């Protein structure tokens, strides 16, 4: 870049450089994320291969596509380092894991900026509807204690964590939200967890969480007031896994077109500061 | 307007804007990488602290400077998770590890773009003088087999890896280069290694590999024709480690000025990437 | 018209670039690769020369074009120097004790030499300018010298007993000897195993391309202390494995060839040398 | 690449740039080649030296003249790397060795553009009256088998060399000539021989083969039609070897003038290659 300042021209030359799918077929990569159960049901040693030849049909050169195996929504949630240009992740609603799923969607579907937090030495504060605490790891257990303007507890003793308020009991991915503009002494189990202070924003012009199962709704809003429904949030009717993949292939471009590359220069988008 | 569409027009207003170092002192972080031997020779429980107060002199607020300990060039060359805004890495001249060092420099000093490779299902090929295969891990052992336009070996049987050509025997960081425009069945030891397909892009507006000892080199060109010498590639004359650090501190700004803003990370981006 | 140097080639800027140039060299020229035994031994294949040759078609060199010559040491390679092909690119494995052996060999290939024979027995010689050097080479070259004043008398020596001579080379395989210009010297070489010839330097070589493996280098190939020349026909590669070295040499053949080319004496031009 | 493609506009300035022998005395080297018998007959440990002082008379500075000893026309023919600017080679008429001598003259007196040949893998042919096969070594034995346009023998089986046609039986230097424009499977004894494909051309502006004895009629062409007699092909009447050398010295310039070493140099002797 170096350039944003100094506006573009709005003249309606009206020409539209035809296509766009013919540049993405040549230059981009497609990464498919699925759960173990998905592949196990397929039971072939060459399914990744067969689908790949089928992918040439839709226009993706041999070395282009891929296949990454998450075995659970919890593991996939923490060490997600989206590998390719375009990532389409397959999630088959599991009804008890809904929020696990919501927290994972909220992370992939969106653009995140994070800094590290030292729960040990400092007493901090969430700023706007976009400042959230995203923690993830083996077993994430977060207890909180709100401070009045004196560094004193409110319903707690900053001295004994037995008076803290538990807001997460051993999760694999957690986006914690506290009353904005209030300091809190935090007590995470840093041994198995890592908690970082993130500011939200830009969405993701990649993922395309495709949901298998139920009667699926997701609520990225930590609030109650809003409900956002984006194009990068699709849903498929479950029959068999082979069918799911056939559809994903038969409609790759349609799915890719709902995302759009150009937004992917980081390994993992846990933006570090 | 974000769309990484560009225009700018250079009228010579000639407003030479002043300082530059007084924005970096306030807003940036400095991360010093050294080897264990470096710290061991210093033998103080408060060396990181003493140097930090000394860093206030050069203008870096207390919570600003961080000290990361790599214990070897091979491990350091691994995940490369450069933590701070400005990274200046101290490398002690080990003559047997030269290429290990070269491969590590090539990674920090430069801007890399990578994708994952599946050695199992798809035989690959590099495209230009900028498409290289960077693999790294516990023990990286890469054997290769060039394919003619039929998916058949050339000096090898795509079936028995005992006929492959070994191009890396158990390294911790490896940037492999093959004849451009030729497919190859690859045989890495994925158990302990990870091999990824990278395209070299921009350079790094951060590191500043400072080399201790020798007379020196470390060439990051894969070819024979070119030799690039950048500002982010400095050298210091070894005496004692305490002296090295004193100098690094006494010339922090000079060293920082030879790097600056890590352009690929700058907020102001978009279509170019972060 | 043959030697009468027309005083000028025009100088008019017609400005027409006669495109490519690599497409004449691919068709008409030969490439000779010189390597040490250790290089090939590490490769351990009976078909490495062959595999690389097919790979050379990629870079544009027809089958019968590339030749592979095996020197087993820097000393031997520097003793009969009969560059066989149009373009010669010689690979040198950094041996720190043999540095000067290497320097003397580079000085010979990288440059264009003119020599005459010397009769150490009957005529005491002298070098004339910074370009008159004595290049001797063979089994075991041992050169002792005795400077003569303007009377044919020794200076620090007796032209009669070689036990008073000054030894300037003890059993080398290639030696470029330099003495104080404009002084006669009775020479005592071991002509049995050595041959010493009087050479005038000059023309450089528009061929070799000594590619150096290992070290750190900077190379001081001058006899004086004042100058240090760094030419394009003096390249360097980072050592990993030998297979890698060759892959690179192949992947960048043209780049390496482009840094050489022609060779004054290898064209129509001769009515000269 | 400075040369031609321009024209030297004559104009008869008629200015005479006197002498020419004064530049050659200062800047050139003279190499005398003789046979062993020559030196043996002289029987002095200082003959090379005496002649050298005598050479100052004719104008050649001390370190200028060199004396190279071939012991036979056959070895000299293999190892002829001409060392100096000007080479004048003394040859003693041996009547049985005449062709050995002819083949050696043909090599020094001329110019020769040669490429290596792989007798093992390919069916070769000469192109013009200037494409010849010059082979030389310990013992050169060449058998040939002409191929019709099918890669089949003509009077031979490309399979059994017992049907080949022998055209050289153990020579030390051989310039072979075959019917132009015909492929031939070659069978040389590469163990002791080396055969290379040469294109001829530029006579030599150096060697001055001086012939001792006989009565000489030198036919140095491969054909029957031509007979070339050049200035670099001189003859002396045999008396004693000391006399021969005295004459060579007494007429060094005359002999040098019949050569002129500008086109010389080259960068080593014989062959060439431009492989």
């Amino acid at each position: 870049n170096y350039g944003i300042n100094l506006p573009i021209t709005g003249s309606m030359d009206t020409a539209y450089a035809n296509s766009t799918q013919e540049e993405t077929f040549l230059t981009s990569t497609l990464c498919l994320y699925y759960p173990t159960e998905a592949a196990t049901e397929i039971n072939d040693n060459s399914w990744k291969d067969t689908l790949s030849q089928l992918f040439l049909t839709k226009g993706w050169p041999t070395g282009s596509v891929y296949f990454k195996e998450y075995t659970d929504i919890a593991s996939f949630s923490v060490d997600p380092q989206l590998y390719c240009d375009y990532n389409v992740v397959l999630m088959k609603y599991d009804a008890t894991l809904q929020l696990d799923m919501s927290e994972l969607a909220d992370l992939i579907l969106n653009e995140w900026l994070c800094n590290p937090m030292d729960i040990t030495l400092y007493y901090y504060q969430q700023t706007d509807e976009a400042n959230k605490w995203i923690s993830m790891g083996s077993s994430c257990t977060i207890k909180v204690c709100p401070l009045n303007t004196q560094t004193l507890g409110i319903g707690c003793l900053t001295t004994d964590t037995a008076t803290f308020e538990e807001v997460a009991t051993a999760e694999k991915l957690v986006i914690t939200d506290v009353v904005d503009g209030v300091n809190h002494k935090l007590d995470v189990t840093t041994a198995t967890c890592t908690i970082r202070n993130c500011k939200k924003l830009g969405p993701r012009e990649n993922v395309a969480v495709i949901q298998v199962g139920g009667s699926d709704v997701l609520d990225i809003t930590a609030d109650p007031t809003t409900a956002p429904q984006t194009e990068r949030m699709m849903r498929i009717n479950w029959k068999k896994w082979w069918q799911v993949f056939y559809t994903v292939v038969d409609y790759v471009n349609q799915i890719i077109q709902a995302m759009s590359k150009r937004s992917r220069s980081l390994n993992s988008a846990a933006f570090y500061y | 307007n974000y769309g990484i569409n560009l225009p700018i027009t250079g009228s010579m207003d000639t407003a030479y804007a002043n300082s530059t170092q007084e924005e970096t002192f306030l807003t940036s972080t400095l991360c010093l990488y050294y080897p264990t031997e470096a710290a061991t020779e210093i033998n103080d429980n408060s060396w990181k602290d003493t140097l930090s107060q000394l860093f206030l002199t050069k203008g870096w607020p207390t919570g600003s400077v961080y000290f990361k300990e790599y214990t070897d060039i091979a491990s350091f060359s691994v995940d490369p998770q450069l933590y701070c805004d400005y990274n200046v890495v101290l490398m002690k001249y080990d003559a047997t590890l030269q290429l290990d060092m070269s491969e590590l420099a090539d990674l920090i000093l430069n801007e890399w773009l990578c994708n994952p490779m599946d050695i199992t299902l798809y035989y690959y090929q590099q495209t230009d003088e900028a498409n290289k295969w960077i693999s790294m891990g516990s023990s990286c052992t890469i054997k290769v087999c060039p394919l003619n336009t039929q998916t058949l070996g050339i000096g090898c049987l795509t079936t028995d890896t005992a006929t492959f050509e070994e191009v890396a025997t158990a390294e911790k960081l490896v940037i492999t280069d093959v004849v451009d425009g030729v497919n190859h069945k690859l045989d890495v030891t994925t158990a302990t290694c990870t091999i990824r397909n990278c395209k070299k892009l921009g350079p790094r507006e951060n590191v500043a590999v400072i080399q201790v000892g020798g007379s020196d080199v470390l060439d990051i060109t894969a070819d024979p024709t070119t030799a690039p010498q950048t500002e982010r590639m400095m050298r210091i004359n070894w005496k004692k480690w305490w002296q090295v650090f004193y100098t690094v501190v006494d010339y922090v700004n000079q060293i920082i000025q030879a790097m600056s803003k890590r352009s690929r990370s700058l907020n102001s981006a978009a279509f170019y990437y972060r | 018209q043959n030697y009468g140097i027309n005083l000028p080639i025009t100088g008019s800027m017609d400005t027409a670039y006669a495109n490519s140039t690599q497409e004449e060299t691919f068709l008409t020229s030969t490439l000779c690769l010189y390597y040490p035994t250790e290089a090939a031994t590490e490769i351990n294949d009976n078909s490495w020369k062959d595999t690389l040759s097919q790979l050379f078609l990629t870079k544009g060199w027809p089958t019968g074009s590339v030749y592979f010559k095996e020197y087993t040491d820097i000393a031997s390679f520097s003793v009969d120097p009969q560059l066989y092909c149009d373009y010669n690119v010689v690979l040198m494995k950094y041996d720190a004790t043999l540095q000067l052996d290497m320097s003397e060999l580079a000085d010979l290939i990288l440059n264009e030499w003119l020599c005459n024979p010397m009769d150490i027995t009957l005529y005491y010689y002298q070098q004339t300018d910074e370009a008159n050097k004595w290049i001797s080479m063979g089994s075991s070259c041992t050169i002792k010298v005795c400077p003569l004043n303007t009377q044919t008398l020794g200076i620090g020596c007796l032209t009669t007993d070689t036990a008073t001579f000054e030894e300037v080379a003890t059993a080398e395989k290639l030696v470029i000897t330099d003495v104080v210009d404009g002084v006669n010297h009775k020479l005592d070489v071991t002509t049995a195993t050595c041959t010493i010839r009087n050479c005038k330097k000059l023309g450089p070589r528009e061929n070799v391309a000594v590619i150096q493996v290992g070290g750190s280098d900077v190379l001081d190939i001058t006899a004086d202390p004042t100058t240090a020349p760094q030419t394009e026909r003096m390249m360097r590669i980072n050592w990993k494995k030998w297979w890698q070295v060759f892959y690179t040499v192949v992947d960048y053949v043209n780049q390496i060839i482009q840094a050489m080319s022609k060779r004054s004496r290898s064209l129509n031009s001769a009515a000269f040398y | 690449n400075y040369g031609i493609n321009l024209p030297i506009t004559g104009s008869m300035d008629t200015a005479y740039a006197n002498s020419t022998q004064e530049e050659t005395f200062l800047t050139s080297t003279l190499c005398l080649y003789y046979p062993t018998e020559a030196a043996t007959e002289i029987n002095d440990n200082s003959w090379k030296d005496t002649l050298s002082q005598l050479f100052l008379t004719k104008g050649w500075p001390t370190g200028s003249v060199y004396f190279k000893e071939y012991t036979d026309i056959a070895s000299f023919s293999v190892d002829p790397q001409l060392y100096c600017d000007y080479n004048v080679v003394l040859m003693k008429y041996d009547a049985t060795l005449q062709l050995d001598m002819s083949e050696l003259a043909d090599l020094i007196l001329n110019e020769w553009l040669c490429n290596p040949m792989d007798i093992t893998l390919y069916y070769y042919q000469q192109t013009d009256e200037a494409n010849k096969w010059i082979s030389m070594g310990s013992s050169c034995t060449i058998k040939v088998c002409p191929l019709n346009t099918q890669t089949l023998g003509i009077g031979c089986l490309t399979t059994d060399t017992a049907t080949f046609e022998e055209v050289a039986t153990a020579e030390k230097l051989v310039i072979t000539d075959v019917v132009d424009g015909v492929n031939h499977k070659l069978d040389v004894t590469t163990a002791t021989c080396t055969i290379r494909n040469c294109k001829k051309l530029g006579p030599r502006e150096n060697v001055a083969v001086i012939q001792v004895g006989g009565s000489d009629v030198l036919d140095i062409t491969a054909d029957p039609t031509t007979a070339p007699q050049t200035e670099r092909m001189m003859r002396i009447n045999w008396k004693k070897w000391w006399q021969v050398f005295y004459t060579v010295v007494d007429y060094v310039n005359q002999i040098i003038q019949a050569m002129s070493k500008r086109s010389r140099s080259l960068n080593s002797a014989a062959f060439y290659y431009r492989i």
Binding site: - | L157, T163 | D45, N46, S47 | -
Partner: protein
């Protein structure tokens, strides 16, 4: 005139193939003489 004849040819070259392709199915037999072929190692007899 020549116009045709000349051009006429380059026009009808596509044929070259078809025909070319006949005489093969028809000529002799073809033979796969590339049986890979592996190289050296040296190991030997060990007893007294």
């Amino acid at each position: 005139m020549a116009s045709l004849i000349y051009r006429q040819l380059l026009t009808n070259s596509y044929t070259v193939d078809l025909s070319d392709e006949i005489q093969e199915i028809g000529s002799t037999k073809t033979q796969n003489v590339t049986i890979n072929l592996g190289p050296f190692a040296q190991t030997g007899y060990a007893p007294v």
